[PDB]
Amino acid sequence: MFVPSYYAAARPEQAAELVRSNPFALVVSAVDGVPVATHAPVILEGDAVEGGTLLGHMARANPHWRSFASSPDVLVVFSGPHGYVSPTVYATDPAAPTWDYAAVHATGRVELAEDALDVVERTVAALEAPRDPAWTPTPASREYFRALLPGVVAFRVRVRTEQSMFKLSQDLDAERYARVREAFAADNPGLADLMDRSLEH
Amino acid sequence: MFVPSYYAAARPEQAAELVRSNPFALVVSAVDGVPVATHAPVILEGDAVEGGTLLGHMARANPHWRSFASSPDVLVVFSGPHGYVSPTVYATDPAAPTWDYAAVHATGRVELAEDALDVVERTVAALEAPRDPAWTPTPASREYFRALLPGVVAFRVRVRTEQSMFKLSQDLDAERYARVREAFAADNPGLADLMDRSLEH
Ligand code: HEM
Numbered sequence: 001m002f003v004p005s006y007y008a009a010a011r012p013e014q015a016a017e018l019v020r021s022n023p024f025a026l027v028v029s030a031v032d033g034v035p036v037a038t039h040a041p042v043i044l045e046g047d048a049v050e051g052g053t054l055l056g057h058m059a060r061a062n063p064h065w066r067s068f069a070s071s072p073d074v075l076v077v078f079s080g081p082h083g084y085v086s087p088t089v090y091a092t093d094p095a096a097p098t099w100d101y102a103a104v105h106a107t108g109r110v111e112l113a114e115d116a117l118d119v120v121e122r123t124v125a126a127l128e129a130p131r132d133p134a135w136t137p138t139p140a141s142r143e144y145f146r147a148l149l150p151g152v153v154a155f156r157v158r159v160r161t162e163q164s165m166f167k168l169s170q171d172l173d174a175e176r177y178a179r180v181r182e183a184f185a186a187d188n189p190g191l192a193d194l195m196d197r198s199l200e201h
Numbered sequence: 202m203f204v205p206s207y208y209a210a211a212r213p214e215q216a217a218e219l220v221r222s223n224p225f226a227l228v229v230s231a232v233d234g235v236p237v238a239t240h241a242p243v244i245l246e247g248d249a250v251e252g253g254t255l256l257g258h259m260a261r262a263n264p265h266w267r268s269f270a271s272s273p274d275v276l277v278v279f280s281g282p283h284g285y286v287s288p289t290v291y292a293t294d295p296a297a298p299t300w301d302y303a304a305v306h307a308t309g310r311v312e313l314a315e316d317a318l319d320v321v322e323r324t325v326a327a328l329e330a331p332r333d334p335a336w337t338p339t340p341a342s343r344e345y346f347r348a349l350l351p352g353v354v355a356f357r358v359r360v361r362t363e364q365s366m367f368k369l370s371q372d373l374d375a376e377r378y379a380r381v382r383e384a385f386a387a388d389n390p391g392l393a394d395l396m397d398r399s400l401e402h
């Protein structure tokens with residue numbers, strides 16, 4: 001990921017907020033020399049991505065985690081709202097398209113987590129908290145979680161470096177920016193909201 | 202990525218259809234043995250992902266492509282609709298959550314593409330074709346593309362292997378399945394559509 005200065009986060013908390021809002025992540029490691037990726041729910045422990053700790057899990061039957069034993073470096077990609085920007089939206093005569101998006105990339109050493117129960121229970125808590133209503137695991141469901149643990153592998157990543165991209169057209173002039181934000185208002189409310197938040201100072 | 206039998210693609214054209222429908226991809230390779238990823242528009246040349254060729258571009262100022270000159274293996278991830286499955290929807294008591302999603306992972310050897318102009322023009326054509334009205338570059342815009350060319354690097358991936366995941370709850374019995382599909386119908390119609398297509402024969 002390369003992040004041009006004008007697409008950097010306006011405030012550092014924006015990276016953590018993107019991570020928390022988009023927990024279904026891509027966990028990537030270099031099995032041999034080839035990249036291999038698993039889609040998995042990953043949560044953040046700590047106030048900031050940099051220096052924070054990521055917690056995730058996958059199927060034990062997914063052999064990806066077996067490469068994690070050597071504690072190699074992994075990349076976790078969190079992707080927020082995104083959308084194609086067609087030059088039709090600009091209404092200007094020389095133009096080229098782009099794609100607007102926001103993403104956080106976290107890199108660090110992965111470690112298998114012995115407390116797989118705690119990881120999945122924390123993941124439930126995080127993902128359900130903003131739903132209306134939030135699902136509260138019953139005692140029966142918590143005993144179920146315990147019974148399921150042989151089939152799951154949890155892992156932790158201590159974040160050594162992170163980058164965040166907020167590519168949200170903030171380099172356009174006022175009229176063209178207004179057209180882009182307006183065009184995303186109906187079809188892509190999530191992207192328009194991120195657009196609004198990127199200009200809040 | 203590991204693909205349980207229940208979540209394998211039903212028909213082989215479904216992988217290529219996902220790729221063509223979701224061109225904003227994640228291009229992943231090793232840089233000093235650690236994974237690095239760039240978000241970029243990537244198009245498919247060919248009827249099938251496996252054995253097909255992917256074409257994409259990225260900023261020249263993005264250093265990711267400098268690791269391609271050795272022609273290492275890359276992974277390109279195409280992501281379709283996805284959504285969290287809360288146990289609230291199952292309406293059963295011992296339960297656990299999951300996440301439903303569809304994705305295609307293409308692996309092969311990457312090479313830098315000299316005709317960067319042709320790559321970006323084919324990308325314009327591909328992404329503007331499903332839109333109405335479609336944006337067709339004027340001669341002025343084509344001249345502008347030529348002016349932009351120093352800042353762009355194009356690349357090709359000859360796809361050696363491909364995996365597709367269609368994790369769409371098809372393992373569920375009918376009453377639990379109907380509740381999952383009904384709950385996505387309002388909030389995530391693209392995902393509901395993908396579940397419908399997963400049951401076709
Ligand atoms: C909190 C929200 C959760 C989400 C979004 C979620 C999602 C997922 C996903 C996407 C996979 C596939 C991973 C892969 O491809 O390797 C998976 C696997 C698995 N998860 Fe979770 N999970 C959640 C909570 C839990 C909990 C609380 C448990 C309790 C032990 C659990 C147990 C398992 C097991 C046993 C597997 C492997 C077998 C299977 O795929 O069902 N998960 N989960």
Ligand code: HEM
Nearest residue numbers: 096097098099242259260263321324325346349350352353
């Ligand atoms: C057709 C749809 C297109 C889309 C969705 C698109 C999207 C993008 C994206 C996401 C990037 C950032 C890559 C990175 O982070 O390294 C990029 C870079 C770039 N693209 Fe494209 N592009 C398109 C067409 C074109 C065309 C026709 C040209 C004409 C030469 C062009 C020239 C460039 C240049 C110069 C850069 C680097 C500077 C910049 O980020 O604006 N692109 N494009």
